[PDB]
Amino acid sequence: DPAISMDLLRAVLQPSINEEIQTVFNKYMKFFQKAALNVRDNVGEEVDAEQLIQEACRSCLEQAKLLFS
Amino acid sequence: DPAISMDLLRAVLQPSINEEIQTVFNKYMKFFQKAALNVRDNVGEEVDAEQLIQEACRSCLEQAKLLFSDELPGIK
């Protein structure tokens, strides 16, 4: 299955690609942190700021898939 | 819902983040291109090499979501 061989290469490259993606996101993290703290500061204790930050980061990656449509 | 402020920020940052992601993937693209051509050469004409490359790139982004989930493949 052609998708499987591609996937084996993908797995090989993932650790390097992850490291560079982390370095990219580190530059933006402060913006997400501030915005998520803002939400918590306005709404209250029942807002999990860390979870808002993580969801927003995962969404960015989801939307970045449109680079490869 | 006030937490939609996260989405809006995200939409604002996306173009910049997308440019840097592209720059990252350009360094690895030659591996994916060679592998996809190898598959097409060894299976036949009905393999779309471009589509194999794209699907592998999207999978990379999917797996990169583990960086931001509650160990992780990395270079450190």
Residue numbers in the entry:
A (entry chain B): 62 to 130
B (entry chain A): 62 to 131, 142 to 147
From the paper:
Recent proteomic studies have identified a novel HDAC1/2 complex in Homo sapiens and Caenorhabditis elegans called the MiDAC complex. In this paper, we show that DNTTIP1 forms a stoichiometric complex with HDAC1 and the ELM2-SANT domain from MIDEAS. In conclusion, we have shown that DNTTIP1 is a dimeric protein required for the stable assembly of the cyclin A associated MiDAC complex. In addition to contributing to the assembly of this complex, DNTTIP1 also mediates a chromatin-binding activity that is likely to be important for substrate presentation to the active catalytic site of HDAC1.
Human DNTTIP1 (56–147) crystallized with six molecules within the asymmetric unit. The structure was solved at 2.1 Å resolution using MAD phasing with seleno-methionine substituted protein. It was immediately clear in the electron density that the protein was arranged in the asymmetric unit as three dimers. Each monomer consists of a long amino-terminal helix divided into three by two distinct kinks. Carboxy-terminal to this long helix, the peptide chain folds back on itself leading into a second, shorter helix arranged at ∼60° to the central portion of the longer helix. The dimer is arranged such that the longer helices in the two monomers lie anti-parallel to each other and form a saddle into which the two shorter carboxy-terminal helices are packed together, also in an anti-parallel orientation. This arrangement results in a large buried surface between the two monomers of 4083 Å2. Remarkably, this represents 69% of the whole surface of the monomer. The core of the interface between the monomers consists entirely of non-polar amino acid side chains. The Dali protein structure comparison server identifies no structures that are significantly similar to the DNTTIP1 dimerization domain suggesting that this is a novel fold.
